[PDB]
Amino acid sequence: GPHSMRYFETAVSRPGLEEPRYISVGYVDNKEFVRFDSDAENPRYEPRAPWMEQEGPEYWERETQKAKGQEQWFRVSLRNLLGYYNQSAGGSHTLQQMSGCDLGSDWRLLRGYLQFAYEGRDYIALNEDLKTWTAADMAAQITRRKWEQSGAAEHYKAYLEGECVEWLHRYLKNGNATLLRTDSPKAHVTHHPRSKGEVTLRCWALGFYPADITLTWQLNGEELTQDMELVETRPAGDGTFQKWASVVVPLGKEQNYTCRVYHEGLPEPLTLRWER
């Protein structure tokens, strides 16, 4: 199956003499596995998934030292941008970066990613060819020219096709069992008063993992997507997710509606209806 690894980095400058705060989060298959935060008492990369405890001290030390360098790189880059955008000091600014690789079914590199944003908007990004850049505005064209001249793309291409792939493979082996785990959703339907002779039937899916899930309401067995109320999937806070979908059903004609829940952990889609 396909897999991925990403590092999401953030640098925020703040009013005063105080230095920016640098935060770096690593993900494997969209699951946080490592994290660094310059605001911490003893700032260093820390494991965020149990299977990373397999790595030795030299790993944490090397990653921590790379983060210290990044914290300085971001300070310099933030100061550079203030000039490109003609901004004075004493403001609040955000620089973000997403970097990583996607592996295909053959577990070979499928696509490399390297992008930046400033104040929450696209700044510059390495194109899929891992050779050229797409600059989002005039200021970024400055960085683009600077990087074409310095040949920065070659550095990122080497990482994306080499290190990124090598380590993603290692992490998948180390957190094998854990990363492919699935917690099937526990589902149930609740009945709500609503209006005049019309009630609300709400289908709940709780305690599932991964977050991917699909809820559907059916009329006598036939799909029913039109006036269905959905809620964005949300963290329960214990590592699992929640989600619900509801419909307003004419009083009495409850038992005619069925809710179907689809999730990778399920041996078969769940099928249920108003109970009680």
Partner: peptide, 9 residues
Amino acid sequence: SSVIGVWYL
């Protein structure tokens, strides 16, 4: 394993 920046923006 994280990537590092070399040339600045």
